[PDB]
C-alpha cells in the first residue's frame, strides 16, 4: 500500500498549468470578428469596405 | 470492492476535452478592444472616429 502513495504523490507532482497557444486563439477571434463585420456590412447594403 | 473499480473505470471513460465557445470569446474581446479604443480616443481629445 506504500507504493500506492508512491505513485499518487509522484503523479501529484504534475504541474497544474495548461499552457494554451495564443496564436490560434487570436486567429479564431479574428475570423469570428470578420464574420460579424461581414454580417454588419450586409445589413447596410454595401456601405463598407466591400 | 470490484464495483468500485468498475465505476471508477466507467468514470475514467470520460473524455478530458472541454469545448469552449468561440463567438462569446470573440464578442468579449471585441467589447474590451472597444473600451481600450474609447480610452485612447478620450486621451487624444476627439481626434478619432468620434
Amino acid at each position: 500500500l506504500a507504493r500506492v502513495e508512491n505513485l499518487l504523490e509522484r503523479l501529484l507532482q504534475k504541474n497544474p498549468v495548461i499552457k494554451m497557444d495564443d496564436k490560434v486563439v487570436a486567429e479564431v477571434v479574428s475570423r469570428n470578428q470578420a464574420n460579424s463585420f461581414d454580417q454588419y456590412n450586409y445589413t447596410m447594403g454595401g456601405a463598407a469596405y466591400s | 470492492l470490484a464495483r468500485v473499480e468498475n465505476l471508477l473505470e466507467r468514470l475514467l471513460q470520460k473524455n478530458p476535452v472541454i469545448k469552449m465557445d468561440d463567438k462569446v470569446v470573440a464578442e468579449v474581446v471585441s467589447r474590451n478592444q472597444a473600451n481600450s479604443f474609447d480610452q485612447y480616443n478620450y486621451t487624444m481629445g476627439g481626434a478619432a472616429y468620434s
Binding site: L1, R3, V4, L7, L8, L11, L12, K14, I18, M20, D21, V24, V25, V28 | V4, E5, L8, E9, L12, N15, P16, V17, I18, K19, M20, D22
Partner: peptide, 27 residues
Amino acid sequence: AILVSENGSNFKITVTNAGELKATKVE
C-alpha cells in the same frame, strides 16, 4: 487495493492532458 492504485494512476494520467478545444483545434 492494487486495482484502486492502478485506477487512480491512470485517472490522474488521463486528467493531465485536459481539453480546451476552440472549435476543432487544440487550445
